Design a binder for these strands. Structure first.
Length: 115
DNA sequence: CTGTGCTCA
C-alpha cells in the first residue's frame, strides 16, 4: 500500500505546478468554468450543491485538478470534505483509500493527455 | 483494484 503511494505520489509531484494550495482555489475561482466544478472549489459545499454522491463529487474534482497540472497528495487529501473518511478517519484507513482513488483518477487523466 | 467513480455503449 504505502510503497505504491510513494511511486504514485512521485508522479503527481513531478506533474505538480509547485504552487501551494492557496493558489489553486484562487486561480480556479477567478476563471469562468462550469458552476459544478467552480462552486465546489469556491464554496464550503462538496456534493449537496449538485446533489451528487460524495464519492463522485470527489472523483470529478480530483480529475479536474490533474488536468490543471496542480495534482499533489497534500492538496488532494486536504480539499476533501468533512463527509469523507479520507480525513475524518471514521474507521476505514485513509492510506489505502488514497492509493485506490488516486491510482484510478490519475490513470484516467494521464492516458487522456498522453502523446 | 481493500468503499465505487468516466466515455462515444
Amino acid at each position: 500500500t504505502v510503497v505504491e503511494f510513494e511511486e504514485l505520489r512521485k508522479e503527481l509531484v513531478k506533474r505538480d505546478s509547485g504552487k501551494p494550495v492557496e493558489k489553486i482555489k484562487e486561480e480556479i475561482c477567478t476563471k469562468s468554468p462550469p458552476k459544478l466544478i467552480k462552486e465546489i472549489i469556491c464554496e464550503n459545499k462538496t456534493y449537496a450543491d449538485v446533489n451528487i454522491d460524495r464519492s463522485r463529487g470527489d472523483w470529478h474534482v480530483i480529475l479536474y485538478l490533474m488536468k490543471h497540472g496542480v495534482t499533489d497528495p497534500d492538496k488532494i487529501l486536504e480539499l476533501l470534505p468533512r463527509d469523507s473518511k479520507a480525513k475524518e478517519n471514521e474507521k476505514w484507513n485513509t492510506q489505502k483509500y488514497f492509493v485506490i482513488t488516486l491510482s484510478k483518477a490519475w490513470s484516467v487523466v494521464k492516458k487522456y493527455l498522453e502523446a
